């Protein structure tokens, strides 16, 4: 079975966390929701409190993962950007040629950790200036952008499409089509 690491920081966008976790699990991916600060419950951007499966410290010992997923949220992305542990995970994932996926403000943590420079990326429109400061990426307006092993997307309303792109990358179009079918997607 493919395995996914979702890094959950205080202030993360709950929808951008839960949609990919749920859709990936529907696809048969073994997902670890790893709390950046530890194993305790995490208060998200709109005050939903999600209980992580494990601390990031322990989730690290169980690598490697086929994808590392970064939700958005202003404070969540800031917390991911400030974490030396996140830096190491993303650098290792990049060096082993593993997929990294980030949505909305989440891609600004790639900039903070110097991940995937020169890739074509998208972000939320409001995060574009932050992502593009320094000119380290090429910007895209696509709802989901996949440039090799860097997969980015724009907002809560692209989370289904972001999650199915991860499923397609790990498990193929057929499995993604199976998962999509009962979602009543537009």
Closest CA relative to residue 33, chosen from 53, 61, 50, 58 = 53
Are 153 and 103 in contact by the 8 Å Cβ rule? The answer is yes
Catalytic residues: 104, 124
Work out the burial of residue 1: count CB atoms within 10 Å of its CB; fewer than 13 is exposed, 13-18 middle, 19 or more buried.
exposed
Resolution (A): 1.5
In angstroms, rounded to a whole number, what is the distance separating the alpha carbons of residues 151 and 144? Answer: 7
**Whole-Å CA distances, 186 to 143, 153, 181:** 14, 17, 11
Please name each of the domains of the chain with its CATH number: 3-183 (3.40.50.880)
Q: SS3 of 19, please?
A: helix
Experimental method: X-ray
Rounded CA separation 13/80 (Å): 12
Q: With contact defined as beta carbons under 8 Å apart, do 9 and 80 qualify?
A: yes
Nearest to 73 by CA among 112, 109, 122, 22: 109
**Is the bond leading into 61 cis (omega within 30 degrees of zero)?**
no
Q: How far apart are CA 6 and CA 33, in angstroms?
A: 5
DSSP string, 41-61: -EE-TTS-EE--SEEHHHHHH
């Amino acid at each position: 079975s493919k395995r996914a690491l979702v890094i959950l920081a205080k202030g993360a966008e709950e929808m951008e966390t839960v949609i990919p976790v749920d859709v990936m699990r529907r696809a048969g991916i073994k997902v670890t929701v790893a709390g950046l600060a530890g194993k305790d419950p995490v208060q998200c951007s709109r005050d939903v409190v999600i209980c992580p499966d494990a601390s990031l410290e322990d989730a690290k010992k169980e690598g490697p993962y086929d994808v590392v997923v970064l939700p958005g949220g202003n404070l969540g992305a800031q917390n991911l950007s400030e974490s030396a542990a996140v830096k190491e995970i993303l650098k290792e994932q990049e060096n082993r040629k593993g997929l990294i996926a980030a949505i909305c403000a989440g891609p600004t943590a790639l900039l903070a950790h110097e991940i995937g420079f020169g890739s074509k990326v998208t972000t939320h429109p409001l995060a574009k200036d932050k992502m593009m400061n320094g000119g380290h990426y090429t910007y895209s307006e696509n709802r989901v952008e996949k440039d090799g092993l860097i997969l980015t997307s724009r907002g809560p309303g692209t989370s289904f499409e972001f999650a199915l792109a991860i499923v397609e990358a790990l498990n193929g179009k057929e499995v993604a089509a199976q998962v999509k079918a009962p979602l009543v997607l537009k």
